[PDB]
Design a protein around this ligand. Sequence first.
Ligand SMILES: O=c1ccn([C@H]2C[C@H](O)[C@@H](COP(=O)(O)NP(=O)(O)OP(=O)(O)O)O2)c(=O)[nH]1
Ligand SMILES: O=c1ccn([C@H]2C[C@H](O)[C@@H](COP(=O)(O)NP(=O)(O)OP(=O)(O)O)O2)c(=O)[nH]1
Ligand SMILES: O=c1ccn([C@H]2C[C@H](O)[C@@H](COP(=O)(O)NP(=O)(O)OP(=O)(O)O)O2)c(=O)[nH]1
Ligand SMILES: [Mg+2]
Ligand SMILES: [Mg+2]
Ligand SMILES: [Mg+2]
Ligand code: NI
Ligand code: NI
Ligand code: NI
Ligand code: NI
Lengths: 169, 169, 169
Amino acid sequence: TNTLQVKLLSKNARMPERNHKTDAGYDIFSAETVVLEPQEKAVIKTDVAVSIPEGYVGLLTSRSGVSSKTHLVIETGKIDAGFHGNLGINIKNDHEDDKMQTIFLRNIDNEKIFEKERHLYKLGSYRIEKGERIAQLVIVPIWTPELKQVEEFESVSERGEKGFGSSGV
Amino acid sequence: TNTLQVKLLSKNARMPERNHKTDAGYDIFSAETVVLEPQEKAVIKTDVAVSIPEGYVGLLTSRSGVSSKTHLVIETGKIDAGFHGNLGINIKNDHEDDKMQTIFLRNIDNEKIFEKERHLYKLGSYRIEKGERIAQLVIVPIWTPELKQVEEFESVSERGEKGFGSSGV
Amino acid sequence: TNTLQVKLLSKNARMPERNHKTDAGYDIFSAETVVLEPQEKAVIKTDVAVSIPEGYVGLLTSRSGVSSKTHLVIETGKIDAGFHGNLGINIKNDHEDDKMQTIFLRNIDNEKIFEKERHLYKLGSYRIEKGERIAQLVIVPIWTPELKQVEEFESVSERGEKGFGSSGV
Ligand SMILES: O=c1ccn([C@H]2C[C@H](O)[C@@H](COP(=O)(O)NP(=O)(O)OP(=O)(O)O)O2)c(=O)[nH]1
Ligand SMILES: O=c1ccn([C@H]2C[C@H](O)[C@@H](COP(=O)(O)NP(=O)(O)OP(=O)(O)O)O2)c(=O)[nH]1
Ligand SMILES: O=c1ccn([C@H]2C[C@H](O)[C@@H](COP(=O)(O)NP(=O)(O)OP(=O)(O)O)O2)c(=O)[nH]1
Ligand SMILES: [Mg+2]
Ligand SMILES: [Mg+2]
Ligand SMILES: [Mg+2]
Ligand code: NI
Ligand code: NI
Ligand code: NI
Ligand code: NI
């Protein structure tokens, strides 16, 4: 089967979309408008549910555009096969709280939003509007075998136990 | 073969466990109790070694529960095939050091731990107990081809060189 | 085909290299020498272009050595199939700006670099030299199906809607 079951949970939800024909992931739309202060953490609702078949995992991960330009950090979520719940974007405004005020909010383009109302926000605060693409869903196959406890492994590897920068830099 | 060789390195080690029948990763137990101050970095030992077969990679990655609730950031580790060493959780308490004291430590549920002894900890400090699931192991297949230097690619793509938010937002 | 098309864009570019025979990723060399202050963000050029075939994604991701030892955080980039552009390492010096001076820069080994010239740098500043391996490219297969809007999914899963630490910890 070359089909994925996607369910829209609300009117605020929008169906994921792939950018180019040969692209890896389906861009994820935010279902809610959230303002994030420096160091603030949140799980942004997408109101989108998927039925990933067995033997596959969905990687709910950040986009290079938003991530490189803004301080919004998204933890790559491992969407289990059969997770029929509301996909949540595990997010954090990783900007430092230097404790000085500003009068502008910052959009996902790192640009200061222009508004007629006068407000005092914390510096580094971001606004994410409903319907904006802040994430993407890359679905990769997995290998889930039966685990086996052993005293020692049947063969020696060229790597051995070497890791964490054992080679040069 | 539908079997993975797992070796326990100590009595503090516990064998990885999959939550649901169709889930993606095997939950990783911590083999040591560590207290992490704000901004502090560590590599937490699991005392668990795996023999991943050739053509596959293990993704030693964070769990959504711990990551969304706490300031503990785990870098997704790429466990090479044949790495027979001690799996280390590349971790950081990404909480800001605002330089004010507290009398409670915070567990992996972001709750303040109750204890009879009186101590002064830094605000944002986390305690990770031995035997607690803070990570998971998702094993995905890989494609390792022979690299080839070319003057130019044989075909043009619809994407071209476009990237880093070349589409909208 | 067991071949990947790699193009070098400049004399500063170096072709990716795999550490061990059975390793997952090809180590990525930096094409430029960059000094990163605390909290500073950048996209480091590699001057290396790849032609990943359809049905695969490249994961431009951090190395365990550099990541665990330094404050340099690299966001795992999802290199689309047919992205013929300059691979950019989405990086950030996630070290806290505590606003105190130092006279040494810090290399990717977290060691203070010795130099005859006297300068005042910010504490937590890192220097990344041209030709140093700070990243790696792990290529995994993907599953890009045709999406389908449904009122409800055809079957019930044992997981259901449970997530974000629904099991224990
Ligand atoms: O979080 C991690 C990451 C890696 N590892 C192990 C698995 C892997 O085989 C090894 C190093 O992986 P990488 O090649 O990705 N990092 P690095 O290039 O720094 O190590 P080396 O120089 O030995 O390849 O360390 C962990 O135990 N935990
Ligand atoms: O770290 C990275 C991430 C991506 N890239 C490249 C590869 C990919 O094909 C392209 C953008 O990938 P994404 O679609 O995941 N991010 P975004 O949606 O912001 O870019 P676009 O809008 O062009 O799709 O940039 C890098 O060179 N380095
Ligand atoms: O960013 C995310 C991450 C996960 N999820 C969903 C998908 C997955 O099936 C579920 C939890 O995934 P994990 O098993 O990796 N984390 P955790 O172990 O904390 O949840 P549980 O205890 O329920 O397994 O939550 C999201 O919606 N967004
Ligand atoms: Mg995109
Ligand atoms: Mg789990
Ligand atoms: Mg390496
Ligand atoms: Ni800034
Ligand atoms: Ni930070
Ligand atoms: Ni807090
Ligand atoms: Ni330090």
